Design the sequence.
């Protein structure tokens, strides 16, 4: 399961806020410096940093809009059974001058 392992062929890595920057070896020699913002892939669960789960489409089926604003679907529990669920998209999706935009807690 060899996902990741950037550190093996990079150096001068550092973190500032949510951003990792490092200088990494290219396939045919030479280096490149790049950054990755970790806010979209790591989350704080009750004081513990965790990798965010796979996109919900991987573990949910039959997604649809129920009525004017609810996302409904059937999703897998940790025990791997599908159950019904819904979420009101009006909670956090706004019309900003004609375009759908997220506004989070
Ligand atoms: Na560079
Ligand atoms: Na505006």
Sequence:
């Amino acid at each position: 399961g060899r996902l990741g392992k950037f550190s093996q062929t990079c150096y001068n890595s550092a973190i500032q806020g949510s951003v990792l920057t490092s200088t990494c070896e290219r396939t045919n020699g030479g280096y490149n410096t790049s950054s990755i913002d970790l806010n979209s892939v790591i989350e704080n669960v009750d004081g513990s940093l965790k990798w965010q789960p796979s996109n919900f489409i991987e573990t949910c089926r039959n997604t649809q809009l129920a009525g004017s604003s609810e996302l409904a679907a059937e999703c897998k529990t940790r025990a791997q059974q599908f159950v019904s669920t819904k979420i009101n998209l009006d909670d956090h999706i706004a019309n900003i001058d004609g375009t759908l935009k997220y506004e989070g807690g």
Q: What stands out?
A: Strands lie at 10-16, 19-25, 31-37, 42-45, 48-51, 60-66, 70-76, 82-88, 93-96, 99-102.
